[PDB]
């Protein structure tokens, strides 16, 4: 988690005139970002405070209220090398894909830098170490290494979806299972 | 599809991007900006840099200025106007970026031709000395001598210093040596137009002879000033051996570096047409006589002024007679097997280099023999160019090229007959020949007066257009070469930074060997076509 500082312009309809500005701008800003991904600054969660707000203007052919304000929104990314709790979900032979419940399943760690004795089997047995192994529903500690950013394809109303994707290297001992200790 | 074929970058950057590409690898960012703009718009003013780009005014400009000055990447000129104040205009300076493209290639010939000594400490010594020269762009003797460690031999590094001045190579820093050839001619043209005390309005054509002849003799003293001067370098105070002036600084030069490779091109032609021994006999002659041989320096008056229609020869042959003068007069009398690292007289091996003249050399005066630097170039450009078409396309493309060069401007009637064999395959490679320029197409109708088809056709001339297409081979080869080498960096940048901090894992060492492989080979490809371009820059 980290706190970004950004600016933006808000359009509030006549329907919200009965309430207070700060309350109106709040709801609007919530409909703006929320769960949506903000480019290059990481993924955003919620909104914090409101500053710099000034007199809003009006365009001739509408009748609404356009206000340009800046605010600090709470976003998400720990840092380059942080270790954080999670667990795997799905799998094939590439590497394990660890999902942190509460943010996204986007985290995926292929097996390259992992322990020297790891291999996938078609036998439906997930993975094997020369110690032991584990599977889904069990908590996993994973470290961050690499981060990538891409653009988006046009939306199609009724695969390459790497909107926000993080991967890492777990080779340092004591990772992937918390009951090995204690 | 997907544009990955690099059709995007293909069309829009002839010349141009070449320059700011090399300085980007050199420095990058702001450094590429100024030079790249200095090319496109040509002549540039200090204030003018700010207007166009909005380049972070006066912080970058003053920083880049002195940065380009030390390595002399900008041609400097200052003057004034009849109105007042002052103005300073910058030009793209000679080729200084080509020298940055050279680098070790220059130092190569420096190391290689520094022998006649045998395998000494010189290797590790001057490698450190020369690399300090080109990098800083200018070196004063004393401040550099201060960099040398104490309580040791001080003249060990000065064992070869006065030997760096040598004959060619490093010369002194002098004054206006960097200067537009057009401008210095105009600045020197003063005191010529200016000179007459209301003499007499007779024979207006004498103003020609006055200014010209007085300019030529004043031009000669300026160009021969950096060439050979024994004043500074040969200074020999007592209580020591010959030692170069501690005050006056030095700089490298175009003289023997451009000469060394030019001889190689002659050797490659020699070695092809004669034995290995004959190439050596012809080599030992060139090594001694390369000093007073203008060669690469030949025109020297060309850039910066008009030639003529009428007086073109009277200009040209005036140079040709001094190209007759110096080689004939000054150059060595017949020697016998000088030193070297076949007994008696080796002139018999010259006689087999004599009896066979065509295509090249073998010009003789009674009592003295030497190779012309004028008539040698046409047959030098011929061979190499013919070998280019030989390399690129098959054997069929070769034969037809000279077929047009035997006679001139004829139709397919006598061509089909006299060329080789078959019509259809000739028309095939005729289209491949006429594909990119170089034969043009003739201009004339058959009784149609330009009207319509069935008119007669002829294939003719066009040398310079069959030249410049080898000047398009200059940048676009080295471009993608160097570029995708640089793109190989930023892609592996995360790896390289990890490698530098390390100076682990199976797959990390894999991509480490990968880039290094590509690195080596791509520099070997660079120097390859580098030697190919250098011969095509003249005539």
């Amino acid at each position: 988690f980290i706190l970004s500082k950004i600016a933006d312009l808000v359009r509030i309809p006549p329907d919200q005139f009965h309430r207070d500005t700060i309350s109106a701008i709040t709801h609007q800003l919530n409909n703006k970002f929320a769960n949506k991904i903000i480019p290059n600054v990481g993924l955003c969660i919620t909104i914090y405070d409101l500053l710099t707000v000034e007199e809003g203007q009006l365009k001739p052919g509408d009748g609404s209220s356009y206000i340009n304000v800046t605010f600090r929104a709470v976003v998400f990314k720990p840092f380059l090398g942080e270790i954080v709790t999670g667990w795997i979900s799905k799998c094939t032979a590439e590497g394990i894909k660890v999902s942190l419940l509460g943010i996204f399943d986007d985290i995926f760690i292929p097996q390259n830098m992992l322990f020297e004795g790891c291999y996938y089997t078609p036998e439906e047995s997930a993975w094997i170490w020369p110690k032991l192994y584990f599977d889904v529903n069990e908590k996993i500690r994973f470290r961050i290494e690499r981060e990538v950013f891409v653009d988006v394809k046009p939306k199609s109303p009724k695969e390459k979806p790497p909107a926000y994707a993080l991967l890492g290297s777990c080779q340092t001992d004591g990772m992937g299972l918390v009951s090995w200790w204690e | 599809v997907m544009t990955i074929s690099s059709l995007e970058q293909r069309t829009l950057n002839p010349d141009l991007f070449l320059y700011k590409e090399l300085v980007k690898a050199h420095l990058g960012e702001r450094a590429a900006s100024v030079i790249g703009m200095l090319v496109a718009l040509g002549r540039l003013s200090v204030r003018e840099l700010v207007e166009k780009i909005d380049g972070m005014d006066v912080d970058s400009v003053k920083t880049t200025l002195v940065s380009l000055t030390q390595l002399r990447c900008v041609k400097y000129l200052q003057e004034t106007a009849i109105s007042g104040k002052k103005t300073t205009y910058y030009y793209y300076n000679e080729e200084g970026i080509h020298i940055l493209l050279y680098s070790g290639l220059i130092i190569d010939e420096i190391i290689t031709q520094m022998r006649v000594n045998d395998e000494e400490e010189h290797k590790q010594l001057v490698a450190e000395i020369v690399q300090n020269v080109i990098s800083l762009g200018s070196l004063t003797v004393e401040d550099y001598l201060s960099s040398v460690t104490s309580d040791s031999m001080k003249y060990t590094i000065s064992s070869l210093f006065v030997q760096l001045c040598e004959m060619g190579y490093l010369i002194q820093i002098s004054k206006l040596h960097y200067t537009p050839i057009e401008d210095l001619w105009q600045f020197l043209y003063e005191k010529h137009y200016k000179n007459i005390p209301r003499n007499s309005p007779l024979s207006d054509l004498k103003k020609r002879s006055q200014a010209k002849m007085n300019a030529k003799t004043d031009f000669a003293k300026i160009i021969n000033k950096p060439n050979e001067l024994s004043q500074i370098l040969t200074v020999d105070p007592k209580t020591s051996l010959r030692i170069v002036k501690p005050t006056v600084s030095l700089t490298i030069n175009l003289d023997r570096f451009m000469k060394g490779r030019r001889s190689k091109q002659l050797i490659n032609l020699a070695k092809t047409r004669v034995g290995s021994v004959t190439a050596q006999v012809y080599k030992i002659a060139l090594r001694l006589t390369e000093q007073k041989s203008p060669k690469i320096r030949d025109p020297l008056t060309q850039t910066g002024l008009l030639q003529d229609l009428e007086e073109a020869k009277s200009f040209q042959d005036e140079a040709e007679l001094v190209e007759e003068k110096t080689p004939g007069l000054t150059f060595n009398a017949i020697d016998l097997a000088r030193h070297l690292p076949s007994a008696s007289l080796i002139n018999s091996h010259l006689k087999i280099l004599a009896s066979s003249n065509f295509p090249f050399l073998n010009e003789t005066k009674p009592g003295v023999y030497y190779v012309p630097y004028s008539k040698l170039m046409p047959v030098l450009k011929s061979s190499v160019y013919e070998y280019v078409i030989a390399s690129t396309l098959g054997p069929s493309a070769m034969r037809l090229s000279r077929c047009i060069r035997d006679n001139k401007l004829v139709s397919e009637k006598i061509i089909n007959s006299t060329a080789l064999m078959k019509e259809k395959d000739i028309r095939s490679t005729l289209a491949s020949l006429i594909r990119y320029n170089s034969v043009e197409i003739q201009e004339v109708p058959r009784t149609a007066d330009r009207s319509a088809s069935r008119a007669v056709f002829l294939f003719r001339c066009k040398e310079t257009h069959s030249y410049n297409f080898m000047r398009q081979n200059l940048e676009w080869n080295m471009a993608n070469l160097l570029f995708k080498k640089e793109k190989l960096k930023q892609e592996n940048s995360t790896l390289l930074k990890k490698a530098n901090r390390d100076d682990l894992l199976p797959s990390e060492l894999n991509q480490l060997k990968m880039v290094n492989e590509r690195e080596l080979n791509v520099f070997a490809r660079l120097s390859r076509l580098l030697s190919l371009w250098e011969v095509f820059q003249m005539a």
């Binding site: - | 293909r10 004669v274 066979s356 398009q472 676009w476 070469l481 190989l488 791509v522």
Partner: protein, 89 residues
């Protein structure tokens, strides 16, 4: 017709190596009469002369004759490299 242009690809093959060869026009007068398959006339004097004149073969030296020098030698990409043509620029 078709018989023509196919007759010049044979008799000129190995005769080169056996050639200083004096009197360049006699060189034909030699070649013109040989193998008993001999062709006809001086029309072949300027034939193999001014056809084979280029593409290595024999050098051109004065007093009408032919030399030999460099023909004896010939008778004896990961990421981005070469492609050595086109591309305009």
């Amino acid at each position: 017709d078709i018989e023509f242009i196919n007759s010049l690809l044979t008799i000129v093959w190995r005769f080169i190596s056996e050639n200083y060869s004096t009197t360049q026009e006699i060189l034909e007068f030699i070649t013109a009469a040989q193998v008993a398959n001999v062709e006809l006339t001086p029309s072949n004097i300027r034939s193999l002369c001014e056809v084979l004149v280029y593409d290595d073969k024999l050098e051109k030296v004065t007093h009408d004759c032919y030399r030999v020098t460099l023909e004896s030698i010939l008778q004896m990409s990961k990421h981005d490299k070469e492609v050595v043509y086109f591309d305009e620029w």
